[PDB]
């Protein structure tokens, strides 16, 4: 045939793949962690957004750390041969490298390891996307007035906030990042490559949001999400 190019992930398998959404709102009292008001808005938006991208969406609410681990183990052991990609959305409390089950923390590394090129072979060479609405620390942004492929390859982490920083959630509108992510997927998924979509998300979050708090420490703060790509190809959600 004519000359071929290898710049873009094959996204025309029979299925787009799984979108696993882990929505942690209510935490065991013993943990001392607050309820995450507004997260259901996020979970609902995410479900609809990925539904229209033709992902097989599975929502799971209020999972323990043990339940998160076993869910990810089990999902990694499914046959993904007929699926183009894998998406996992985590919505919870967190710290750098860590997300919280209802009863305690899970290392992000433990979660993603199940999907390593060598440990989940039906996803080898396919984009594995991890979208994470969770704190990565306690810093606040004051803003300023204007043999073959690596086992860690083909992962993308779309973090809601910069390393070390709090991430902002609005109890009525949902989180800044998830709001903006869904809006930009809705508007551009049939147009832009995914990194270019994620860049629009960065700018929306950075420009359009600023915290209001009665507490001076947490008032007038800003947020910039953080795209971390080990993808080896461009990712378009559409095909021919």
């Amino acid at each position: 045939s004519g000359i071929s190019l290898d710049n873009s992930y094959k996204m025309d398998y029979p299925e787009m793949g799984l979108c696993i959404i882990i929505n942690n709102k209510n935490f065991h009292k013993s943990t001392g962690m607050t309820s995450r008001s507004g997260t259901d808005v996020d979970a609902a938006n995410l479900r609809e957004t990925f539904r229209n991208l033709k992902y097989e969406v599975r929502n799971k609410n209020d999972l323990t750390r043990e339940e998160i681990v076993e869910l990810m183990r089990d999902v990694s052991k499914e046959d993904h041969s007929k699926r183009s990609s894998f998406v996992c959305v985590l919505l919870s409390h967190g710290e750098e490298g860590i997300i919280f089950g209802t009863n305690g923390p899970v290392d992000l590394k433990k979660i993603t390891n199940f999907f390593r090129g060598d440990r989940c072979r039906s996803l080898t060479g396919k984009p594995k996307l991890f979208i994470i609405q969770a704190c990565r620390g306690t810093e606040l942004d004051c803003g300023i007035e204007t043999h073959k492929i690596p086992v860690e390859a083909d992962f993308l982490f779309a973090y809601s906030t910069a390393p070390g920083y709090y991430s902002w959630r609005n109890s009525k509108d949902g989180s800044w990042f998830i709001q903006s992510l869904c809006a930009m997927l809705k508007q551009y998924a049939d147009k832009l490559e995914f990194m270019h979509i994620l860049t629009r998300v960065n700018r929306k979050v950075a420009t359009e949001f600023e915290s209001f708090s009665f507490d001076a420490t947490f008032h007038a703060k800003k947020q910039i999400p953080c795209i971390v790509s080990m993808l080896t190809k461009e990712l378009y959600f559409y095909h021919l």
Binding site: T34, R36, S37, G38, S92, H93, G94, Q133, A134, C135, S160, Y166, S167, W168, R169, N170, S171, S175, S211, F212, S213, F218
Partner: peptide, 4 residues
Amino acid sequence: DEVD
């Protein structure tokens, strides 16, 4: 507005 709250933090995660």
